UniProtKB/TrEMBL annotation:
<protein>
    <recommendedName>
        <fullName>CRISPR system Cms endoribonuclease Csm3</fullName>
    </recommendedName>
</protein>
<comment type="subunit">
    <text>Part of the Csm effector complex that includes Cas10, Csm2, Csm3, Csm4 and Csm5.</text>
</comment>
<comment type="similarity">
    <text>Belongs to the CRISPR-associated Csm3 family.</text>
</comment>
Length: 79
RNA sequence: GAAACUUAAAACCGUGUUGCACUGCAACCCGGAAUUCUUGCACGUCG
């Protein structure tokens, strides 16, 4: 979570706390699509069925906003 | 007046550092995007 690459004609800013929910919602939506798919190989002949378990988020560097880490753990609760 | 060289001999020479102090130095990601994937019954034949 940082400024990123702002571009030559823009005013740089940090992503709001509403935008971090929409990033984590697309991660767990893309991890539920992988449980129907097969992660490399033959796949259509029965290979590579995969499963996720115990997905949880932390804060490794720096503090968060407050009551935000627990609602990022709820987007990951449905895989 | 006609007749007898202010001539002869003598180095503008001897000694002496264009020498002493001084960083081609400070700042800079060989970095950003990309599924070793697509098709395939361990099966057929019996005086």
């Amino acid at each position: 979570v940082s400024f990123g690459t702002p571009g030559e004609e823009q005013k740089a800013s940090l992503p709001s706390s509403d935008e971090i929910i929409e990033d984590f919602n697309a991660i767990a939506r893309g991890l539920k699509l992988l449980e129907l798919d097969y992660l490399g190989g033959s796949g259509t002949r029965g290979y590579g069925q995969v499963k996720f378990s115990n997905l949880k988020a932390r804060a490794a560097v720096g503090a968060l906003d407050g009551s935000l880490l627990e609602k990022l753990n709820h987007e990951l609760a449905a895989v």
